[PDB]
Amino acid sequence: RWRQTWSGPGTTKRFPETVLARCVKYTEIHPEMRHVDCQSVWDAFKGAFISKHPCDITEEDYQPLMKLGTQTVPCNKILLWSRIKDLAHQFTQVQRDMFTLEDTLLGYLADDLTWCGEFDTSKINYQSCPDWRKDCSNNPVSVFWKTVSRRFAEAACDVVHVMLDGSRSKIFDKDSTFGSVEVHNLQPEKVQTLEAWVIHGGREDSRDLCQDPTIKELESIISKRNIQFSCKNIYRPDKFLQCVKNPEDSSC
Ligand SMILES: *[C@H]1O[C@H](COP(=O)(O)S)[C@@H](O)[C@@H]1F
């Protein structure tokens, strides 16, 4: 207790209750997911990581959960993001025809949660969980997000949008989950264009961040998949959301 097994936070307080309540709310709000048995979903979720070493999790562990959480999403209305989760979600709460991963069942369940089990008992570990960098990368959380992100990116078609954080050192970071998983699972047969929306953090920062070296890197990487590239600066995120809420406004 003065010395925990892992470096990361333990399983989120009330994790079982929260996942279960999130599943109920989601399936109540979204009519297409009425066939979902939320107890069977929790049980599949559990079976992925309970009684398993939290540094030996595989995508296979999550396949029963992936099967139960299978969902058809409008393929042409997908919004990916990297390092700017809050604005992405604020956007999709207003622009209801667009979807982030966290607007799907599986993403909604797990959003902002941490969890892990123990190899030597059947208990959930509420004390600590492996950190991706400091402990091990094949942990329950990281493997979950890799698995579901890959599927989501594979489902995308037509014009796919991505929100990127313009305030960060690497606006596009090839070592991020977006750069290492999502980008390399956009299907060349289906995706026409990836359009980046670069969100500015500064008020007086009116650089064209679509000419940033890392954006050119993204453009170049994507061209190999025969995917076109487009980029837009969002100079004023607060004005952006205002315009999204009130699009018939003249100034928008
Ligand atoms: C796939 O990647 C994005 C965010 O990951 P990151 O670039 O901030 S590390 C999520 O939509 C999902 F995890």
Letter for the amino acid at 203? R
Q: Whose CA is nearest to atom 4 of ligand 1?
A: 82
- Pull the structure tokens for residue 89: 């979600």
Cα(202)–Cα(199) distance, integer angstroms: 9
SS3 assignment, position 80: strand
Beta bridge partners of 198: 164, 233
Helix (H) or strand (E) holding 163: strand 158-165
Q: Which CATH number fits domain 1-72+100-155: 1.20.82.10, 3.40.140.10, 3.30.70.1880, 1.20.810.10?
A: 1.20.82.10
Cα(178)–Cα(168) distance, integer angstroms: 15
Using what technique was this structure determined? Answer: X-ray
Yes or no: say if 145 and 177 are a contact pair by the CB < 8 Å rule: yes
- Residue partners of 3: CB distance under 8 A and separation at least 6: none
Residue 81 has phi, psi (to 5 degrees) of -150, 160
Q: Write the CA distances from 167 to 100, 171, 179, integer angstroms.
A: 21, 7, 17
- Torsion sign over Cα 58, 60, 66, 68: negative
Domain ranges of the chain: 1-72+100-155, 73-99+156-252
Letter for the amino acid at 106? L
Q: Hunting for tokens 């999502």 — which residue is that?
A: 182
Residue 104 CB less than 6 A away from ligand 1: no
Cα(239)–Cα(247) distance, integer angstroms: 11
Cα(163)–Cα(143) distance, integer angstroms: 23
Cα(34)–Cα(31) distance, integer angstroms: 6
Q: One of 23, 136, 157, 243 is an active-site residue; which one?
A: 157
Q: Write the CA distances from 113 to 26, 163, 167, 192, integer angstroms.
A: 16, 22, 25, 33
Cα(217)–Cα(91) distance, integer angstroms: 26
Cα(75)–Cα(77) distance, integer angstroms: 6
The order of strands in the sheet holding 191-199 is: 79-82, 158-165, 191-199, 228-234
Q: One of 23, 38, 55, 75 is an active-site residue; which one?
A: 75
Pairing of strands 158-165, 79-82: parallel
Would residue 75 show up in a list of annotated catalytic residues for this protein? yes
- Pull the structure tokens for residue 121: 């008992």
Yes or no: say if 141 and 112 are a contact pair by the CB < 8 Å rule: no
- Pull the structure tokens for residue 17: 């209750």
Give 82 Cα–ligand 1 centroid separation in angstroms.
Answer: 5
According to CATH, the superfamily of the domain at 73-99+156-252 is NAD(P)-binding Rossmann-like Domain (3.40.50.720)
